[PDB]
Amino acid sequence: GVHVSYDNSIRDADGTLVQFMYGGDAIDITKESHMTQFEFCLDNYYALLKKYNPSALIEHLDVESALKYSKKTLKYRKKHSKEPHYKQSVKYDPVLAKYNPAKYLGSVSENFQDKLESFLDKNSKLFKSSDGVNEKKFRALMQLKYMRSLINPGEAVGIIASQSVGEPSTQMANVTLGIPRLRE
Amino acid sequence: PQNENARAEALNLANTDSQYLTPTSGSPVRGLIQDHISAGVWLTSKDSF
Amino acid sequence: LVTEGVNFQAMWDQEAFIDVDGITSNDVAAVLKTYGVEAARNTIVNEINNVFSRYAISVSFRHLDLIADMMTRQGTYLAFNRQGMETSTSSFMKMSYE
Amino acid sequence: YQRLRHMVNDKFQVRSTGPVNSLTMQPVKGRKRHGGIRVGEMERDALIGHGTSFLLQDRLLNSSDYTQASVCRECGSILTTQQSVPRIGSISTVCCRRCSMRFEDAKKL
Amino acid sequence: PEDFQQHEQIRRKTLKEKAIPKDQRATTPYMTKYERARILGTRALQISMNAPVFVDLEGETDPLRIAMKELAEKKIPLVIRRYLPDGSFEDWSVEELIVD
Amino acid sequence: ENERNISRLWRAFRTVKEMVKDRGYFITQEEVELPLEDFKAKYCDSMGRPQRKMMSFQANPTEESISKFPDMGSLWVEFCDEPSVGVKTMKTFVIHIQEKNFQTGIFVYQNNITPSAMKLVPSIPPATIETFNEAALVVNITHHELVPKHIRLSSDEKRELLKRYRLKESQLPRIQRADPVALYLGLKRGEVVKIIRKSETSGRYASYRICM
Amino acid sequence: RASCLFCHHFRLKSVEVHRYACKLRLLQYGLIDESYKLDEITLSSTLLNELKSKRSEYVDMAIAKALSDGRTTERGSFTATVNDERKKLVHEFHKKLLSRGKCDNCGMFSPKFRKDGFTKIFETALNEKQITNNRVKGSTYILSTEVKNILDTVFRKEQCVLQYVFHSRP
Ligand SMILES: [Zn+2]
């Protein structure tokens, strides 16, 4: 009975909430694959750009508010790092909390956002040496793709996660192992 | 399926093409097998002309 | 060091050597009792993953997150068997299960 | 080589209207009497998880028993309903037995 | 009748509470993979039952192809009502909802 | 061998301040950082045995605490020198709280408590009492890597959450009131906490739980 | 088995029941907190009647206050967490019923019963001193009708609590 609702919160059929964000990033697994492959997406950009087609979507979406808060977060993110999780100050919440990723372009898992920048920085050479596709032009794409890879409200993951565990179980110190452990 | 509602889904939701990927690991479940692999080798091989 | 059995408090006097903050267990309910639901939950995903890890299989954490978050929904550690299913609201599910 | 048993002619069937088991008003095993195909939970579960949900549900319902029925919107029951035995000049109609009274009682007050 | 006139007034008030205004509508501008299906499905049924058809058929004997054909033009006259878990819902015109 | 007892006490005694700080009251960072010797210097006489009583203290909310939790009042921390927890010892401490009018007391027993005194724990609402084992506190649990950060929320914040997700309070994932973390935070029922989960898939990921 | 054959109530005292009567009532409206805050109430029958009154009015105040805002439907608000707490009290409440050894109202003694999986309930006779105390304070299969007669009397008195016990909703 698990239901993601259009709020993206996981809810058991009665409405009882389970998770607020599916993966916590609410990223659809079947669409998650090439997301972290930036170098591939860097190539073919002119193709993907035609597939996602950012043009039409500017109207219906808030591009900015997420991006502001994001950059607002990442600054202070790198600020307090080395301190442990408990001493770490909670001042702002992660991006996806205050911002629906579907309505808001740029609202993105802090993880992906980091991989993107880390990539986009160290590989920023390629943006110059190549045709010159602008980082922003590319950044704006991945964020769009990221937002387009979101889970769909009203699927069945409860079944998925069941089958997702169920099927591979059929595939197969001295601690307890295998299905017996899993059963356990 | 006996009605357009049903077959609407069977076309647009549960599908071969619509499902190219595990929900589990997100990995391709579909692709040519056996012969077709061994063929591609002898085809894509340089000795092919 | 690998510990057979579980007593955390025992280890807590031992931190002169070991790092107590890195202590992890193979027993959920123990952790739930000691470090509470969240750590217990985090332990679950870790433990389950070890299974599929050993068999080289691959399961996206999102599933394991869903399950772990589910078994902890009551803040206790609930089975998927008849017992945990008791608290459910819908009868027919329960009624048609066992 | 060895030709086996298990020739396909022995194994297949389609579209079982006939049997409609009396209790459930549902088909029955194919075999050679004209049954059908069992679905089942693991197959049910897929539909839910598979994605073909409207389709899935519809299929299940229609291949397992669908009619429609009278229910008392008052007594809230399927069973207590029945047809009326009408008069000449009057059409029969459905009424709920539980919420119906002996006519004797009305003229009493 | 007053008891009926009562929960009719009660019908509104709750169903007033459960409606989300246009500006207030918070969900995705996209059409979910599912919403696309059932739209095509429902529209197909109606097209099959001699509902009015806004776009030329051009030789389509398949109502579902027809439904697809309208959807390209957003000529489909439907409205999706998205239920939040509480029961309060939204209402999205088809055409205002971004396809794929 | 007082040494461990001293160490363990000091060690646990540290966790307490850590909690009270974390629970939002005002404690200087160095007061948390008290070394074993100064602890012995301060809290041990010339014995080898520290004095629980000189250890017990009052704590007060910070501004942000008060500003965010106006209902938060003063805290009293208490240790029990006797291993046994006397109903009168309870009665002593209990009335001691009400007399001095603390929002909340905290009473750290050594080993065991008279269950009769347990009945007297809910003695004086609204003021509440919290009881911890000295040995239970040897190691702050929140510091463990599995334990994510926990944040108790203002009633205002709780509203904003529910009104955001349109929930009844009970539809949240529950956290048992007997959960050590709840115990560690001293959660009332019907309180909702923010939990920052560090995903391996995503990054930091916020979640919520309601105390029952 | 928990019935008073003389005080015609549950052998557990009315007051310690009256709290469950209030608590399970709260949970039909799904108030989990207040159930606990109910137990806060305390400062002779006049005392109890005051207490029983104060609990009841406390309940009435809360649920009204609970319904004052949208925290509960008049139909009652019932979720799994709520559904848990019900199964907790109900299970526990039964224990305190089975523990009581004397009707706390009359002080009398009902004899033990012994049942069969084949549904034969054997009444086992009273203990001596009880009959003594009985007249001081004053292995047989039993007829279902008699039993039926027993509980009918019980429920006429015990309706107020069981009305809540058997309904997860108002
Ligand atoms: Zn009727």
Side-chain angles (χ1 to χ4, degrees):
Chain A
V2 174
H3 64 282
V4 176
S5 176
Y6 299 86
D7 62 354
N8 294 334
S9 67
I10 307 300
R11 313 294 187 89
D12 184 4
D14 59 9
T16 299
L17 190 143
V18 179
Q19 301 175 337
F20 303 91
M21 304 299 291
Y22 171 65
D25 58 354
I27 296 303
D28 184 3
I29 291 170
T30 61
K31 292 178 177 178
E32 185 177 3
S33 65
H34 288 82
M35 291 174 64
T36 57
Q37 300 294 99
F38 301 94
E39 182 178 1
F40 174 77
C41 294
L42 171 61
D43 297 346
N44 309 335
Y45 172 81
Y46 296 91
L48 296 173
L49 182 63
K50 295 184 176 74
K51 181 175 179 288
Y52 291 136
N53 191 29
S55 298
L57 303 176
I58 306 302
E59 300 172 351
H60 301 80
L61 298 173
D62 182 2
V63 176
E64 296 178 352
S65 297
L67 297 177
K68 299 307 290 183
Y69 183 78
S70 67
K71 295 175 180 177
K72 184 69 179 296
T73 57
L74 188 147
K75 294 186 175 74
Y76 183 87
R77 183 56 59 89
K78 187 181 294 296
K79 181 189 293 179
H80 295 289
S81 178
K82 293 178 296 298
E83 64 182 344
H85 59 280
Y86 59 92
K87 291 293 181 66
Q88 184 170 354
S89 178
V90 191
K91 187 183 294 179
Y92 57 81
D93 297 344
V95 174
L96 297 174
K98 291 179 178 178
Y99 292 137
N100 183 337
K103 181 180 171 62
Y104 297 140
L105 174 62
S107 180
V108 173
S109 65
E110 177 66 13
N111 193 341
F112 177 82
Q113 183 176 354
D114 293 345
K115 295 182 180 298
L116 177 63
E117 294 303 321
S118 296
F119 166 81
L120 189 146
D121 184 6
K122 294 189 295 184
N123 293 280
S124 62
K125 182 186 294 179
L126 303 178
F127 296 149
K128 296 174 298 300
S129 61
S130 177
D131 189 8
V133 174
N134 184 28
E135 301 178 353
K136 292 179 177 178
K137 297 301 287 186
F138 182 78
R139 176 173 292 104
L141 179 62
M142 300 305 294
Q143 292 177 335
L144 173 60
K145 179 176 171 61
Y146 179 88
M147 178 179 69
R148 294 299 304 280
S149 297
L150 292 176
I151 205 67
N152 289 132
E155 68 181 352
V157 303
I159 305 300
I160 291 304
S162 296
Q163 305 179 345
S164 179
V165 173
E167 184 278 333
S169 62
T170 62
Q171 185 62 257
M172 184 172 283
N174 192 341
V175 65
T176 300
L177 300 178
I179 294 171
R181 175 56 180 163
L182 184 64
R183 174 174 180 168
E184 192 174 11
Chain B
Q2 294 299 102
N3 62 35
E4 296 302 321
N5 275 334
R7 50 173 288 179
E9 252 81 64
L11 291 177
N12 294 281
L13 291 178
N15 301 127
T16 67
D17 52 352
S18 299
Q19 300 174 334
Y20 176 77
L21 293 175
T22 58
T24 299
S25 64
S27 298
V29 296
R30 306 183 71 196
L32 303 177
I33 58 176
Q34 293 181 338
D35 291 344
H36 299 163
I37 283 99
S38 295
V41 173
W42 284 94
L43 194 143
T44 59
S45 175
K46 290 178 178 178
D47 285 345
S48 296
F49 300 95
Chain C
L1 290 175
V2 156
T3 38
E4 313 202 307
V6 170
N7 181 337
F8 300 100
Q9 300 79 355
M11 303 297 99
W12 293 353
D13 288 342
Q14 306 306 316
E15 70 180 346
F17 299 159
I18 61 173
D19 184 4
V20 293
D21 294 347
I23 290 172
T24 61
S25 175
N26 193 29
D27 181 1
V28 174
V31 176
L32 171 60
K33 183 179 179 180
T34 301
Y35 297 149
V37 53
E38 289 300 322
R41 183 187 67 84
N42 295 283
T43 301
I44 292 171
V45 179
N46 297 338
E47 292 180 352
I48 292 172
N49 195 347
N50 295 337
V51 181
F52 295 149
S53 298
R54 181 177 296 275
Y55 293 146
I57 307 170
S58 177
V59 173
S60 176
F61 293 93
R62 294 179 176 79
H63 310 290
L64 306 181
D65 298 346
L66 175 62
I67 295 170
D69 290 340
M70 182 66 180
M71 294 190 290
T72 60
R73 66 186 182 278
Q74 289 301 321
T76 60
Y77 169 65
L78 296 177
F80 279 93
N81 60 33
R82 176 187 178 176
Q83 302 301 100
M85 184 182 70
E86 182 68 16
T87 62
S88 175
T89 300
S90 177
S91 296
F92 286 153
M93 178 182 74
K94 294 185 296 296
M95 184 172 176
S96 63
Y97 177 66
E98 289 177 352
Chain D
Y1 267 84
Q2 303 173 339
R3 179 176 180 171
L4 296 177
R5 294 169 56 192
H6 312 296
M7 299 172 285
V8 62
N9 294 335
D10 296 346
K11 296 155 60 180
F12 66 93
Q13 69 280 5
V14 57
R15 170 50 178 160
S16 294
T17 67
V20 291
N21 179 27
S22 177
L23 293 176
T24 60
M25 290 292 101
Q26 301 176 341
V28 88
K29 309 169 71 160
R31 195 235 263 158
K32 186 252 332 300
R33 96 183 126 176
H34 298 303
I37 313 303
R38 178 171 175 78
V39 177
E41 291 182 350
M42 294 187 290
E43 301 79 355
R44 179 182 66 85
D45 299 347
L47 288 62
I48 302 171
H50 218 326
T52 61
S53 167
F54 210 41
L55 145 115
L56 302 196
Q57 180 273 293
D58 202 358
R59 152 100 321 162
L60 187 167
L61 202 310
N62 308 9
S63 181
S64 261
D65 52 352
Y66 170 88
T67 60
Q68 55 192 19
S70 177
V71 297
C72 182
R73 67 178 69 86
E74 183 181 4
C75 62
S77 176
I78 55 176
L79 294 175
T80 64
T81 58
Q82 73 183 26
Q83 288 299 326
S84 62
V85 174
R87 295 296 183 191
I88 284 173
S90 297
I91 188 64
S92 179
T93 187
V94 181
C95 294
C96 182
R97 182 176 295 274
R98 183 179 298 106
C99 293
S100 62
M101 294 176 181
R102 294 287 178 186
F103 173 79
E104 59 188 344
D105 296 345
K107 292 168 63 181
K108 298 174 183 175
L109 57 84
Chain E
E2 299 84 358
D3 58 354
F4 178 78
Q5 178 61 262
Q6 183 175 355
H7 64 281
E8 292 302 320
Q9 294 174 336
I10 297 169
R11 179 183 295 177
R12 301 290 183 270
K13 291 181 67 65
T14 60
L15 187 140
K16 287 180 178 295
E17 297 175 352
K18 267 65 180 179
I20 297 302
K22 301 296 286 181
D23 60 353
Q24 193 62 57
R25 192 170 66 256
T27 59
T28 177
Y30 295 136
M31 177 173 283
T32 67
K33 178 171 61 65
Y34 302 122
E35 287 167 347
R36 173 180 174 171
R38 185 175 184 173
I39 292 303
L40 294 176
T42 297
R43 184 59 179 166
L45 274 66
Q46 295 174 335
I47 294 169
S48 63
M49 288 194 71
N50 293 275
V53 177
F54 299 93
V55 64
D56 290 344
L57 301 178
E58 298 176 351
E60 293 302 321
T61 60
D62 184 2
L64 186 58
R65 296 296 183 192
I66 299 168
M68 294 177 182
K69 186 174 181 180
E70 289 181 350
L71 182 64
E73 303 175 354
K74 293 184 173 73
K75 296 295 181 65
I76 295 172
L78 298 175
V79 172
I80 292 168
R81 171 173 292 180
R82 293 182 178 176
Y83 290 130
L84 299 177
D86 62 8
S88 67
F89 59 87
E90 296 176 349
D91 285 339
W92 286 90
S93 176
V94 173
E95 61 187 344
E96 67 182 341
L97 188 66
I98 290 96
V99 179
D100 62 12
Chain F
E1 182 66 12
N2 291 284
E3 185 66 14
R4 293 185 180 176
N5 302 133
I6 292 170
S7 177
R8 296 175 60 186
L9 177 61
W10 167 85
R11 188 186 301 176
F13 178 78
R14 185 177 184 82
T15 297
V16 175
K17 291 174 177 175
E18 298 172 350
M19 173 177 67
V20 178
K21 177 182 168 62
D22 289 343
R23 186 171 291 175
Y25 295 127
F26 173 76
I27 289 174
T28 62
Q29 185 62 258
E30 301 79 357
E31 189 178 3
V32 174
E33 297 170 351
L34 179 64
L36 177 63
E37 303 81 357
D38 300 343
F39 174 83
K40 294 184 295 184
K42 292 180 178 178
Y43 298 128
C44 297
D45 53 353
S46 65
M47 176 65 181
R49 294 181 180 175
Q51 298 300 101
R52 304 289 189 274
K53 297 174 180 176
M54 296 190 290
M55 297 172 69
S56 299
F57 62 90
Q58 181 175 354
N60 291 335
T62 65
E63 301 307 318
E64 302 79 356
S65 298
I66 296 167
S67 68
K68 188 186 293 179
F69 302 154
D71 298 346
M72 179 182 285
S74 295
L75 173 66
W76 178 257
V77 176
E78 187 67 16
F79 298 96
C80 186
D81 191 6
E82 299 175 352
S84 176
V85 173
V87 176
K88 293 178 178 178
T89 300
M90 182 65 72
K91 184 177 181 179
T92 300
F93 168 75
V94 168
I95 307 302
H96 181 280
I97 300 302
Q98 188 176 359
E99 291 171 348
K100 295 179 178 180
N101 188 29
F102 295 100
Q103 180 63 59
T104 298
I106 292 172
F107 180 82
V108 179
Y109 65 90
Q110 297 179 339
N111 62 348
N112 289 336
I113 300 170
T114 57
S116 295
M118 294 302 297
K119 294 177 179 177
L120 295 178
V121 175
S123 63
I124 53 173
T128 182
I129 297 169
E130 299 177 354
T131 59
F132 294 155
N133 183 337
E134 295 177 349
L137 303 180
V138 171
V139 174
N140 182 331
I141 58 173
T142 62
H143 302 172
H144 188 280
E145 294 178 350
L146 292 178
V147 175
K149 181 63 172 174
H150 291 79
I151 300 98
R152 180 167 56 84
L153 300 177
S154 68
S155 64
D156 184 6
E157 189 68 15
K158 180 175 65 65
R159 180 173 298 103
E160 298 177 352
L161 176 58
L162 296 172
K163 184 177 180 179
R164 187 178 186 276
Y165 287 91
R166 300 178 180 276
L167 292 177
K168 297 173 181 177
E169 294 176 349
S170 63
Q171 292 174 334
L172 295 174
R174 181 178 178 173
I175 176 172
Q176 291 302 321
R177 185 179 181 276
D179 182 356
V181 178
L183 302 175
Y184 179 84
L185 296 177
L187 299 178
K188 272 71 178 181
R189 292 181 181 83
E191 292 178 349
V192 176
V193 299
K194 182 190 295 175
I195 292 171
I196 301 302
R197 297 179 182 180
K198 185 180 67 63
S199 174
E200 186 64 17
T201 300
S202 175
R204 297 171 67 256
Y205 165 68
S207 177
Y208 297 126
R209 290 291 186 90
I210 182 166
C211 182
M212 295 297 183
Chain G
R1 178 172 55 188
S3 297
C4 177
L5 298 178
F6 302 92
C7 34
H8 297 296
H9 299 165
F10 292 95
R11 294 179 295 103
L12 175 60
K13 63 183 68 180
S14 298
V15 174
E16 291 301 322
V17 174
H18 180 273
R19 54 190 294 268
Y20 291 90
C22 293
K23 293 168 65 177
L24 298 179
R25 178 180 180 172
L26 293 177
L27 301 183
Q28 290 183 337
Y29 297 93
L31 303 174
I32 295 173
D33 184 7
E34 298 78 356
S35 64
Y36 297 90
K37 290 180 177 179
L38 182 142
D39 295 346
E40 298 176 351
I41 296 170
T42 305
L43 275 66
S44 176
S45 64
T46 60
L47 301 176
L48 305 178
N49 294 336
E50 179 66 14
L51 181 64
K52 294 172 70 69
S53 176
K54 187 182 292 180
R55 288 182 177 173
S56 297
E57 63 187 344
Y58 171 77
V59 174
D60 297 346
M61 174 182 72
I63 295 171
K65 182 179 179 180
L67 296 176
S68 66
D69 54 352
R71 288 177 295 179
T72 301
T73 61
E74 183 176 1
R75 296 185 180 279
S77 295
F78 170 77
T79 61
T81 303
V82 172
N83 187 31
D84 182 6
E85 296 304 320
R86 185 177 180 84
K87 294 181 181 298
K88 184 184 293 179
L89 296 179
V90 173
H91 179 61
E92 180 181 3
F93 170 76
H94 286 163
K95 290 181 65 64
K96 291 183 178 297
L97 298 178
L98 294 177
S99 63
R100 183 59 62 186
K102 183 195 293 181
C103 181
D104 293 346
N105 299 282
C106 51
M108 299 293 289
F109 294 91
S110 298
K112 293 177 180 177
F113 294 149
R114 181 180 65 259
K115 67 177 181 180
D116 291 341
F118 293 152
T119 61
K120 292 181 296 299
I121 298 169
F122 290 154
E123 182 181 3
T124 302
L126 292 173
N127 185 31
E128 302 305 319
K129 299 173 180 177
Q130 296 180 339
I131 302 107
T132 302
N133 188 28
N134 288 335
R135 63 185 180 87
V136 169
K137 293 186 174 75
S139 296
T140 299
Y141 172 77
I142 178 170
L143 295 176
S144 63
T145 60
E146 295 171 349
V147 176
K148 165 267 172 83
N149 273 330
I150 295 171
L151 302 179
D152 292 343
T153 300
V154 176
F155 294 175
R156 294 182 181 86
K157 302 300 182 181
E158 299 304 319
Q159 189 67 257
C160 184
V161 53
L162 296 175
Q163 182 64 258
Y164 298 133
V165 175
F166 293 156
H167 295 77
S168 63
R169 297 179 296 102

